Amino acid sequence: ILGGREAEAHARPYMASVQLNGAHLCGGVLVAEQWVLSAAHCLEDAADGKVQVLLGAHSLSQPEPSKRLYDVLRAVPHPDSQPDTIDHDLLLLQLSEKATLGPAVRPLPWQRVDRDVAPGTLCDVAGWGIVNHAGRRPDSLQHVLLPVLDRATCNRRTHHDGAITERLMCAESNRRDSCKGDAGGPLVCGGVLEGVVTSGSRVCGNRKKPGIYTRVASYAAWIDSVLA
Numbered sequence: 001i002l003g004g005r006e007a008e009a010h011a012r013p014y015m016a017s018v019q020l021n022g023a024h025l026c027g028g029v030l031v032a033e034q035w036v037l038s039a040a041h042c043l044e045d046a047a048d049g050k051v052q053v054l055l056g057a058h059s060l061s062q063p064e065p066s067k068r069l070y071d072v073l074r075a076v077p078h079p080d081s082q083p084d085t086i087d088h089d090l091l092l093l094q095l096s097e098k099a100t101l102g103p104a105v106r107p108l109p110w111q112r113v114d115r116d117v118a119p120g121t122l123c124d125v126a127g128w129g130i131v132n133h134a135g136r137r138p139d140s141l142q143h144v145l146l147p148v149l150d151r152a153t154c155n156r157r158t159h160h161d162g163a164i165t166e167r168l169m170c171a172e173s174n175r176r177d178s179c180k181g182d183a184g185g186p187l188v189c190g191g192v193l194e195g196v197v198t199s200g201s202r203v204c205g206n207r208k209k210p211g212i213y214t215r216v217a218s219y220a221a222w223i224d225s226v227l228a
Contacts, residue, residue: 001127002205003176004144009058010066012126014108014193015141017054018093018184019069020045024060024137027127027185028053029193030107033098035227037110037216038091038184040081041199051075053093056105059140060128066104071096076226078219086200087165089214091184092226108186110193111217117169119150123189125171125197125211129181130204137181144178146171148189149210158208167218169195170210178211179204187213 016028016036025045028038036053043051056066073094080088099105117123126143130136154170155162164170171187178185178197187195195213203209216223 001125001129001131001142001144001177001182002179004131004142006138007058007126007141007143009140010056010104012141012143013056013104013106014186015057015126017057017060017128018042019052019054020049022050022052024128024181026181026183026199027129027197028093029186029196030055030099030105031110031193031223032107032227033101034095036093036095037196037223038093039196039199039214040077040089040091041083042184043075043077043091044083051093053095055099057141061139066102068100068105070099078222086163086168086198086212089198089200090196090219090222092223108188108193109191112220114217114220116151117148117189117194119148121148121189122146123148123171123187123194125178125182125185125187127178127182127185127197129179135180144176146176146211154210159210160212164212167215168198169213169215171213172207173205173210174207175205177205
């Protein structure tokens with residue numbers, strides 16, 4: 001997260017760190033007791049590496065009573081995801097067992113009604129991604145509040161030039177933004193999950209290249225099918 005601040009510890013009990021061989025890789029969001037939603041291109045990461053999900057965390061490295069690292073029973077990328085597109089960029093991770101819930105670990109309600117978030121709505125995104133241009137990785141969860149950007153502005157040639165489908169949404173990226181390591185994390189508006197950070201290549205913190213988020217409401221039936 002660029003231009004953000006350290007998050008209040010455990011105030012986002014839905015937040016997940018998706019890990020590969022014990023290192024933070026991507027964000028994710030607990031959407032059911034046994035299921036974490038993240039981004040498909042994260043799993044281009046990779047092969048038969050050990051994918052795990054850390055719940056209940058603030059610090060990646062330090063002991064905390066609520067921290068628990070879960071193994072992953074099954075990883076389910078969206079079937080229409082492709083290496084060279086930002087479309088359908090969702091991944092569902094089935095934990096080894098249902099997560100132990102408490103004040104620091106709880107699924108987030110997610111949007112089922114397929115209607116766009118209003119322009120200007122202030123939403124929250126959080127992550128353990130890089131915090132400066134050098135690539136410094138934070139030990140603790142960061143977040144930033146970002147206003148939703150209307151799709152037509154986002155689709156201008158100066159911006160993302162037609163790439164923002166009805167299944168995608170944008171937020172402003174003026175110095176404050178998600179960046180490398182934040183893919184798959186949650187964009188939360190009014191206490192409800194609305195978006196998942198996409199995991200394609202994108203400059204960070206340039207107002208001319210808004211953040212792009214997959215609209216979870218667009219994929220409600222798919223999420224239900226996988227969890228069935």
